[PDB]
Amino acid sequence: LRGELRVGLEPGYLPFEMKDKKGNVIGFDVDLAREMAKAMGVKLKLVPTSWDGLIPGLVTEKFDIIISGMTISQERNLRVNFVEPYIVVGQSLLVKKGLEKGVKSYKDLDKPELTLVTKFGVSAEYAAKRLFKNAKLKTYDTEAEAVQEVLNGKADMFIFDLPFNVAFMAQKGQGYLVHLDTSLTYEPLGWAIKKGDPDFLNWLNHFLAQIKHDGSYDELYERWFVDTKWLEK
Amino acid sequence: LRGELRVGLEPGYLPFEMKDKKGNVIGFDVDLAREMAKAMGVKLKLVPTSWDGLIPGLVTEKFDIIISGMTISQERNLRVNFVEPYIVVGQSLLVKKGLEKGVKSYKDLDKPELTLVTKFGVSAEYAAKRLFKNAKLKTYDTEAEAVQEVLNGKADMFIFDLPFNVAFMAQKGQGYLVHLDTSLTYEPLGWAIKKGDPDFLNWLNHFLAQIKHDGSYDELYERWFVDTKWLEK
Amino acid sequence: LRGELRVGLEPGYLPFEMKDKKGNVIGFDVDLAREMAKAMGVKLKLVPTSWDGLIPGLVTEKFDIIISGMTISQERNLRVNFVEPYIVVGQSLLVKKGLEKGVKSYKDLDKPELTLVTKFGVSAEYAAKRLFKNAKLKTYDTEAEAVQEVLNGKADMFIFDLPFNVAFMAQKGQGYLVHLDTSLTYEPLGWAIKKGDPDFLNWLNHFLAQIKHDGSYDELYERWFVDTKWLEK
Amino acid sequence: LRGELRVGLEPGYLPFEMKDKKGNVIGFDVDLAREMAKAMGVKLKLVPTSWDGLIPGLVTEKFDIIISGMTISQERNLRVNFVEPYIVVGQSLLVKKGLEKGVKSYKDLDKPELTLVTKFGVSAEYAAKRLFKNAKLKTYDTEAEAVQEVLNGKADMFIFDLPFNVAFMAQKGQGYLVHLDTSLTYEPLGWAIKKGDPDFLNWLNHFLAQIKHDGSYDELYERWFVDTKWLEK
Amino acid sequence: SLRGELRVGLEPGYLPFEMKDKKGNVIGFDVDLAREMAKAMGVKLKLVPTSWDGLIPGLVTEKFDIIISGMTISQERNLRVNFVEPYIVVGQSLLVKKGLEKGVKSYKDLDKPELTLVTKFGVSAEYAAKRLFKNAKLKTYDTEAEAVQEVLNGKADMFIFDLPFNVAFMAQKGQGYLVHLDTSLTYEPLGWAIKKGDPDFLNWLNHFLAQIKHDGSYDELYERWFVDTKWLEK
Numbered sequence A, B, C, D: 001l002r003g004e005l006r007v008g009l010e011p012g013y014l015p016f017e018m019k020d021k022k023g024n025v026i027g028f029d030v031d032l033a034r035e036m037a038k039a040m041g042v043k044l045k046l047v048p049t050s051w052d053g054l055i056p057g058l059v060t061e062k063f064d065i066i067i068s069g070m071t072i073s074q075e076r077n078l079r080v081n082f083v084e085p086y087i088v089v090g091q092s093l094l095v096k097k098g099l100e101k102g103v104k105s106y107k108d109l110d111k112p113e114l115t116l117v118t119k120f121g122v123s124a125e126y127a128a129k130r131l132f133k134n135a136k137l138k139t140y141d142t143e144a145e146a147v148q149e150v151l152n153g154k155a156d157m158f159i160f161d162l163p164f165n166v167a168f169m170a171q172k173g174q175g176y177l178v179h180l181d182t183s184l185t186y187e188p189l190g191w192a193i194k195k196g197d198p199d200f201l202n203w204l205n206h207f208l209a210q211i212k213h214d215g216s217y218d219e220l221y222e223r224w225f226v227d228t229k230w231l232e233k
Numbered sequence E: 001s002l003r004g005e006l007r008v009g010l011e012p013g014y015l016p017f018e019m020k021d022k023k024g025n026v027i028g029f030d031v032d033l034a035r036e037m038a039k040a041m042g043v044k045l046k047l048v049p050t051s052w053d054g055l056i057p058g059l060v061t062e063k064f065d066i067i068i069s070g071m072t073i074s075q076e077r078n079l080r081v082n083f084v085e086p087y088i089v090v091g092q093s094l095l096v097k098k099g100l101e102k103g104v105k106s107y108k109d110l111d112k113p114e115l116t117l118v119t120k121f122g123v124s125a126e127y128a129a130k131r132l133f134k135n136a137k138l139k140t141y142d143t144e145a146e147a148v149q150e151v152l153n154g155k156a157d158m159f160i161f162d163l164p165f166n167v168a169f170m171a172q173k174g175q176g177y178l179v180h181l182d183t184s185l186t187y188e189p190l191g192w193a194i195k196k197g198d199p200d201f202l203n204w205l206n207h208f209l210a211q212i213k214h215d216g217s218y219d220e221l222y223e224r225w226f227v228d229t230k231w232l233e234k
């Protein structure tokens, strides 16, 4: 690769990709992508894309790599190759205040009179249909649209990857929601690239091992997952 | 690959693959293969094959994968590729009664007046050739035939993969054989696929890493290496 | 109604209604009926009554509503109308220490030696007969008489609505018995009024949802089901 | 009410009600009445009835409830009260083998050239008028009789409640018809009772809630909507 | 469950539920609902504009069939009429004069007896403000619109009322002069009332309500009145 590293993501998975107040795209994966560019001695470009355009975009060479906090699922892994996992994740729940009472398991929210909302075409959806099966399930176009349904009284509860939930609790959720943080799925996230390229994978993996033993990774992880400065966009 | 997942294996290797009383082939690898096929959204077609016909069956494109309790050796691995190890194993023995007495190690048993038996052309035959300088070694077409040879007055001791020993011990060698259980080799077991498809490898390694963290693999480990339920066929 | 709302209950079920110290009756249900009366602009009158005279007491205008932890069952529903459920409950078991080990459902405790005990003529009794075939079962007049035999040594297990088993646990059971938390049935508890009054229902259903979105329900709930300050009765 | 529960239904709406080989009527709606009569303490008498006579059979007191896959509408609700819905269904198409190709929405089958058919005076005919402007509409006496006009030459496509179609496909259709399963409407079906009984409502509505939270509704759902045993009939 | 016409009592001037068009017909989210409901029953709509303290008794007295006036389901009222499952959920909000919102985190920063607070007489807000406000002057007026004029006039500092009123008011006149403190302070389910002893008609209404929530009808009327601004050319 010469010139520039084109990375496609979709903004809105806090704290991985979000849109600035200035409209600039920032986050863990964005910093991850600057490092990669640097370590490759090459220019970074981001291409923003909707979740559903990510894999075809990659497969079609709209970009070279995906770094969107994407679950290494066996389905998707048939269309692209995944680098090794750089963070490990699972789905928790955000609930309206009050229905959290006496819940010992997620399983007793799997009730027919309850409405569960996530975003369409994502891990949590697939989790939701595997996990629940009683509760009504509705899906939406964004993480934001979806938690709004429960915030505004339209839904009872919201499911998503755990770090979106804890980012959210910090920025808006503390007062009005409750986070049931017990993880419900084992979801490694890796970067995806298109098949037929083992040389890239070699490079990507080593470059992952480096930052994980460099102290570089742990800084970024501190920045986006423990620290709270970032929250003023 | 679309349609079906063809898996070559050779039954005989308790608890990985054997055939039941009904005539169907079942066991650890089978449940793995079934799980694998489901993850690719595909049908499963086992292709039972004699051992010597497994690699060339594979390289010959008669099936896509070996799942036979195959050992990742440097010799084989010149001919095919292996996924990361799904289980680690090692060679042990069964001796007839009275034999187990006085022994401190394998070295005590490596004597000329004794005959050692094992399946021809297999992992054990190689450790046997390496480990034992003084003892007669005679090989057979199936593990069962090899054991029989010491269930009779014919051989003194049988060597094989340790897990087969522990299962046969529970199956038939209860009163008769004695199990010296000191692992004598380091034997990593792995799925093999033909060379020059690194994408399938990527998909295989990410899948093996799921079932070790899912609980899936764990549920299946118990089933076949602890449960004792499966002895009824 | 006029002048007084008359409530029909039997003190015993904890933490719903219990008599103590001063000989006053108190609990979640009482606190509920208290808010109900302020809402109507009436004065509360509590009419403590043995279980088996609640429904007859109701049909006979001994009192106007039954708020003492009652299951909305189809048998009882033939005889009175239920407001929509105010809480959802379920059978759990208190057992002696030792009994909990390796037990992987209530079902592996259904044995002709073991003795299940309960209060007579209550939802707990009917579930006892439905689930447990083999276990000797004995019945007593109160919840206390029944758990006694278990604490003391005569019977050895106890079955009742879960909220009780945790409440007992927090007062007297913590060193002594083991609580298999798992939910054995689905048991909605509702207020019961006599038939032929759809207006009082309409009113009762709206009152229920007010306190549910009011925070009022929630306060009472913490105060009785989580708060440990009350057990100082 | 005591003695028996009389239940009015029209056989043919697979898999809710249909006449079996011997000629007794079965299905999801019968098993559901069978649960009602057990819980009610009472015997069960099914009163089969032509559809345009059910509402008048109820009001007339020919039976006590209509469980028939009846859609809840405002028109109907003027004459009879409806319990809450027990299932939500949607209208869908059964078209001749071949003319499924190209199509993207139901609208491209709305050509003056094509003949659409369904049963007379039933919520499928109304959606059909509502949704089909051009195509010639013909109405018959029974679902079975209307489809029969696509199975032979006469008509082109068939409109009815999705479960009917999934059922018809698994029973006869696979090689003959094509099923576009995009639900075109949203219709909640409900049980009807004669107006004037608020107590039977309260009963019926709690009963529906039990079985939906119990496992019994789900038993009966897998049974008729999924399993396929039922066809041997 | 009747023949002839469906008669609906309402009090115009709770924007955007009910208002006078100025050609003098009453229009609003409630009227469109009342219009849908009447069609579904195959019957005619008559609106019976009524002043607020006369809605319930008019219903009991059989002057009309149902009240669709954005009325709060309350235990005290529910004693006298029956309510249908609520159809929209609302809370009280505050409209204040310019600047007066700076450095305020909650409603509590506004209790000063210095401050004067106004609303309409005998209405959800009036009872809420008496609960919530302990120090502030509370004055009352026959109409929502007479009430806000006092803060617009600078004879009072802030207006309290159902939140959807405030946003519609902010759009028409308030945008330059007042500021909407839009934190919801009550939990106020809104339902149609009818007289007691009629379970059938309740059955009918509850199922009609479920129908328009799942139709798209409800959402449509909702957008039309509560979100988009077109309705404002009275």
Ligand SMILES: N[C@@H](CCCC[NH3+])C(=O)O
Pocket (backbone or CB within 6 Å): A010, A011, A012, A013, A051, A068, A069, A070, A071, A121, A122, A123, A124, A161, A189
């Ligand atoms: N990691 C999840 C979240 C998607 C985030 C959508 N912006 C997935 O792979 O679907």
Ligand SMILES: N[C@@H](CCCC[NH3+])C(=O)O
Pocket (backbone or CB within 6 Å): B010, B011, B012, B013, B051, B068, B069, B070, B071, B119, B121, B122, B123, B124, B161, B189
């Ligand atoms: N790992 C042993 C197992 C052989 C089993 C023969 N059925 C090998 O590689 O030869």
Ligand SMILES: N[C@@H](CCCC[NH3+])C(=O)O
Pocket (backbone or CB within 6 Å): C010, C011, C012, C013, C051, C068, C069, C070, C071, C121, C122, C123, C124, C161
């Ligand atoms: N839920 C129980 C109540 C416990 C009995 C209280 N003394 C029942 O309805 O049978």
Ligand SMILES: N[C@@H](CCCC[NH3+])C(=O)O
Pocket (backbone or CB within 6 Å): D010, D011, D012, D013, D051, D068, D069, D070, D071, D072, D119, D122, D123, D124, D143, D161, D189
């Ligand atoms: N669900 C529709 C169709 C039932 C068809 C009866 N054979 C209705 O309520 O009319």
Ligand SMILES: N[C@@H](CCCC[NH3+])C(=O)O
Pocket (backbone or CB within 6 Å): E011, E012, E013, E014, E052, E069, E070, E071, E072, E120, E122, E123, E124, E125, E162, E188
């Ligand atoms: N929700 C308010 C409506 C105000 C009506 C004013 N015309 C109430 O029920 O009091």
